[PDB]
Amino acid sequence: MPQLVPFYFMNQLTYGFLLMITLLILFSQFFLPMILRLYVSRLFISKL
Amino acid sequence: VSTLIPPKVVSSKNIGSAPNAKRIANVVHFYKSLPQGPAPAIKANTRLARYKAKYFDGDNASGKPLWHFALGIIAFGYSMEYYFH
């Protein structure tokens, strides 16, 4: 069927490159510094 | 004889010492390090904090949420096979 045999490559690729940029920003700004925040908070308590 | 002896004027062992730095640190840093925190989220009827409560508690490490999440997707494409055909 067409949905399991795409020829829709340009449509797909638009959605593809968008997803990568979305995840990249999302990790970089939101979730990754919040993990270094856990580490640092534990470590700053470790200091005192 | 002499009544002249050190303890009358002490005015620098009643001050100086290193643990003061640690002392003043933990009255300011640790009085707002609340005992239970600000009660961190794990449940609520937001329709997905309920999901967190049954499955994604930091206590749970059983295979049950993994299985639960998987089974939906099996039903999804199989039904969608019949939705497309």
mmCIF file of C-alpha atoms in Angstrom:
data_model
loop_
_atom_site.group_PDB
_atom_site.id
_atom_site.type_symbol
_atom_site.label_atom_id
_atom_site.label_comp_id
_atom_site.label_asym_id
_atom_site.label_seq_id
_atom_site.Cartn_x
_atom_site.Cartn_y
_atom_site.Cartn_z
ATOM 1 C CA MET A 1 0.000 0.000 0.000
ATOM 2 C CA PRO A 2 1.207 3.611 -0.420
ATOM 3 C CA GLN A 3 1.546 4.267 3.309
ATOM 4 C CA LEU A 4 3.882 1.275 3.736
ATOM 5 C CA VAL A 5 5.601 1.926 0.399
ATOM 6 C CA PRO A 6 6.048 5.734 0.513
ATOM 7 C CA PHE A 7 7.254 7.656 -2.508
ATOM 8 C CA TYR A 8 6.458 10.695 -0.348
ATOM 9 C CA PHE A 9 10.159 11.361 0.280
ATOM 10 C CA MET A 10 10.096 15.190 0.143
ATOM 11 C CA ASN A 11 7.087 15.348 2.491
ATOM 12 C CA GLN A 12 8.786 12.886 4.821
ATOM 13 C CA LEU A 13 12.175 14.636 4.729
ATOM 14 C CA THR A 14 10.559 17.943 5.703
ATOM 15 C CA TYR A 15 9.154 16.240 8.812
ATOM 16 C CA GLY A 16 12.472 14.453 9.305
ATOM 17 C CA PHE A 17 14.782 17.469 9.462
ATOM 18 C CA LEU A 18 12.261 19.325 11.579
ATOM 19 C CA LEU A 19 12.223 16.528 14.190
ATOM 20 C CA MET A 20 16.008 16.544 14.563
ATOM 21 C CA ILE A 21 16.218 20.302 15.078
ATOM 22 C CA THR A 22 13.328 20.106 17.588
ATOM 23 C CA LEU A 23 14.943 17.349 19.649
ATOM 24 C CA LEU A 24 18.348 19.058 19.442
ATOM 25 C CA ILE A 25 17.168 22.368 20.910
ATOM 26 C CA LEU A 26 14.908 20.514 23.378
ATOM 27 C CA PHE A 27 17.722 18.424 24.808
ATOM 28 C CA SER A 28 20.317 21.204 24.699
ATOM 29 C CA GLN A 29 18.302 23.906 26.401
ATOM 30 C CA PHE A 30 15.845 21.952 28.542
ATOM 31 C CA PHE A 31 16.703 18.454 29.592
ATOM 32 C CA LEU A 32 20.510 18.181 29.410
ATOM 33 C CA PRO A 33 21.326 21.232 31.626
ATOM 34 C CA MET A 34 18.710 19.974 34.056
ATOM 35 C CA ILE A 35 20.735 16.758 34.344
ATOM 36 C CA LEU A 36 23.915 18.757 35.011
ATOM 37 C CA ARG A 37 21.798 20.648 37.518
ATOM 38 C CA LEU A 38 21.085 17.398 39.423
ATOM 39 C CA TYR A 39 24.784 16.600 39.440
ATOM 40 C CA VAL A 40 25.839 20.065 40.534
ATOM 41 C CA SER A 41 23.189 20.300 43.265
ATOM 42 C CA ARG A 42 24.371 17.006 44.756
ATOM 43 C CA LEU A 43 27.980 18.209 44.436
ATOM 44 C CA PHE A 44 27.336 21.669 45.954
ATOM 45 C CA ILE A 45 25.706 19.935 48.939
ATOM 46 C CA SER A 46 28.803 17.733 48.900
ATOM 47 C CA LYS A 47 30.897 20.891 49.251
ATOM 48 C CA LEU A 48 28.934 22.004 52.337
ATOM 49 C CA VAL B 1 49.199 36.287 95.462
ATOM 50 C CA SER B 2 48.546 37.841 92.071
ATOM 51 C CA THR B 3 44.950 38.186 90.854
ATOM 52 C CA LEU B 4 46.344 38.821 87.348
ATOM 53 C CA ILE B 5 45.480 35.747 85.328
ATOM 54 C CA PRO B 6 44.330 35.287 81.623
ATOM 55 C CA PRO B 7 40.507 34.674 81.889
ATOM 56 C CA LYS B 8 39.483 38.215 82.935
ATOM 57 C CA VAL B 9 40.043 39.583 79.441
ATOM 58 C CA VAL B 10 39.498 36.962 76.760
ATOM 59 C CA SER B 11 38.558 38.655 73.533
ATOM 60 C CA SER B 12 40.064 36.605 70.743
ATOM 61 C CA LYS B 13 39.331 32.970 71.655
ATOM 62 C CA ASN B 14 35.741 34.069 72.133
ATOM 63 C CA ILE B 15 35.931 35.099 68.466
ATOM 64 C CA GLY B 16 38.446 33.484 66.041
ATOM 65 C CA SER B 17 38.299 29.920 64.628
ATOM 66 C CA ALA B 18 37.823 28.196 61.242
ATOM 67 C CA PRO B 19 34.390 26.350 61.644
ATOM 68 C CA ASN B 20 32.630 29.751 61.661
ATOM 69 C CA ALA B 21 32.829 29.734 57.838
ATOM 70 C CA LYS B 22 31.014 26.371 57.748
ATOM 71 C CA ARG B 23 28.580 27.531 60.455
ATOM 72 C CA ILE B 24 27.351 30.653 58.668
ATOM 73 C CA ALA B 25 27.188 28.676 55.446
ATOM 74 C CA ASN B 26 24.699 26.087 56.720
ATOM 75 C CA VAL B 27 22.327 28.500 58.468
ATOM 76 C CA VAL B 28 21.764 30.311 55.164
ATOM 77 C CA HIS B 29 22.118 27.392 52.778
ATOM 78 C CA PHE B 30 20.273 24.898 54.902
ATOM 79 C CA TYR B 31 17.093 26.229 56.377
ATOM 80 C CA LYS B 32 15.530 26.518 52.885
ATOM 81 C CA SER B 33 16.616 23.003 51.954
ATOM 82 C CA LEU B 34 13.103 22.090 53.206
ATOM 83 C CA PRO B 35 12.805 18.592 54.759
ATOM 84 C CA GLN B 36 10.450 17.139 52.157
ATOM 85 C CA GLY B 37 11.352 19.737 49.541
ATOM 86 C CA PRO B 38 8.335 21.556 48.162
ATOM 87 C CA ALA B 39 6.633 18.119 47.838
ATOM 88 C CA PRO B 40 7.698 17.088 44.229
ATOM 89 C CA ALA B 41 5.018 15.992 41.673
ATOM 90 C CA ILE B 42 4.257 12.325 41.092
ATOM 91 C CA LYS B 43 0.413 12.427 40.882
ATOM 92 C CA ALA B 44 -2.415 14.774 39.773
ATOM 93 C CA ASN B 45 -5.413 14.611 37.456
ATOM 94 C CA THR B 46 -3.632 16.315 34.565
ATOM 95 C CA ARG B 47 -4.244 12.973 32.798
ATOM 96 C CA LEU B 48 -0.497 12.222 32.739
ATOM 97 C CA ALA B 49 0.579 12.793 36.317
ATOM 98 C CA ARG B 50 -1.781 9.860 37.001
ATOM 99 C CA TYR B 51 0.341 7.870 34.515
ATOM 100 C CA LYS B 52 3.437 8.840 36.533
ATOM 101 C CA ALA B 53 1.792 7.700 39.769
ATOM 102 C CA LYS B 54 1.124 4.121 38.681
ATOM 103 C CA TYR B 55 4.189 3.514 36.589
ATOM 104 C CA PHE B 56 6.939 6.090 36.909
ATOM 105 C CA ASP B 57 7.335 6.437 40.652
ATOM 106 C CA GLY B 58 10.942 6.384 41.838
ATOM 107 C CA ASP B 59 10.350 3.068 43.527
ATOM 108 C CA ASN B 60 9.036 1.290 40.445
ATOM 109 C CA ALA B 61 11.671 -0.445 38.355
ATOM 110 C CA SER B 62 9.482 -3.391 37.359
ATOM 111 C CA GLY B 63 8.806 -4.431 33.758
ATOM 112 C CA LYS B 64 5.109 -3.554 34.045
ATOM 113 C CA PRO B 65 5.129 -0.014 32.476
ATOM 114 C CA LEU B 66 7.299 -1.185 29.585
ATOM 115 C CA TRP B 67 4.840 -3.966 28.775
ATOM 116 C CA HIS B 68 1.858 -1.628 29.146
ATOM 117 C CA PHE B 69 3.292 0.947 26.765
ATOM 118 C CA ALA B 70 4.252 -1.731 24.202
ATOM 119 C CA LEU B 71 0.809 -3.377 23.942
ATOM 120 C CA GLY B 72 -0.921 -0.207 22.725
ATOM 121 C CA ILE B 73 1.366 0.050 19.700
ATOM 122 C CA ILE B 74 0.741 -3.615 18.767
ATOM 123 C CA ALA B 75 -2.973 -2.814 18.690
ATOM 124 C CA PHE B 76 -2.312 0.391 16.778
ATOM 125 C CA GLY B 77 -0.686 -0.884 13.609
ATOM 126 C CA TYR B 78 -2.778 -4.076 13.520
ATOM 127 C CA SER B 79 -6.033 -2.103 13.646
ATOM 128 C CA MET B 80 -4.547 0.400 11.195
ATOM 129 C CA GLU B 81 -3.824 -2.488 8.845
ATOM 130 C CA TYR B 82 -7.564 -3.027 8.907
ATOM 131 C CA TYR B 83 -8.133 0.755 8.649
ATOM 132 C CA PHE B 84 -6.084 0.858 5.455
ATOM 133 C CA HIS B 85 -7.230 -2.539 4.219
#
